[PDB]
Amino acid sequence: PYPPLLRAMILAQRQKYGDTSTEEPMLNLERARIDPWDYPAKLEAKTKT
Amino acid sequence: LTRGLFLGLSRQETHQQLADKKSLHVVEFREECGPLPIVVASPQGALRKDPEPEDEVPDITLDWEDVKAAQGMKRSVWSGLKRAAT
């Protein structure tokens, strides 16, 4: 779920533009993956791209 | 000072006098009354049908004191002072 107010803002925001769909707004955690602190960091200097 | 003053005040030109020499309506715009055109004086006799020449930029003698006042360049500590009633 989106957090309570943010969900409301999104709902109302799409009512305003004429989108009627009542499908619940969902927050996608696929890219929110983080390694536990135990995971060792690379000492190698970063190549800038 | 008092000679000068009386001379000055004596030489005032009334709104009726002005109305008559220009032959127009002299109309007074109050700020508190908005755009509403109060007609102060009307030219007894025959009014002109001729508008006044519109001078884009007027040539008038200006006093550097009044201009300095208008633009907020008068900073004297003596001017704002609160005084007793008239």
């Binding site: 957090p3 927050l27 996608n28 929110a32 | -």
Partner: protein, 77 residues
């Protein structure tokens, strides 16, 4: 505050920090709470970075930006 070159106190010398008592239950519960919470907020944060991508691209190279450009060029000529 002190400086890199300002020698530490004589009293603080033989002292190193003393860590708090750990309540295992509450502590575990808490660690989970933090992991979840941070996940959620990481998501949200990405959501907003995207919003900024959009708004920037749209007010730069978007429709009405181009409309303005063309119209102004044409008016000019």
């Amino acid at each position: 505050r002190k400086t890199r070159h300002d020698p530490p106190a004589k009293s603080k010398a033989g002292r190193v920090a003393t860590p708090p008592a750990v309540d295992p239950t509450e502590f575990f519960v808490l660690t989970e709470r933090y992991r979840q919470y941070r996940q959620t907020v990481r998501a949200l944060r990405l959501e907003f970075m995207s919003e900024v991508r959009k708004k920037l691209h749209e007010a730069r190279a978007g429709v009405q930006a181009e409309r303005k450009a063309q119209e102004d060029a044409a008016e000019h000529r």
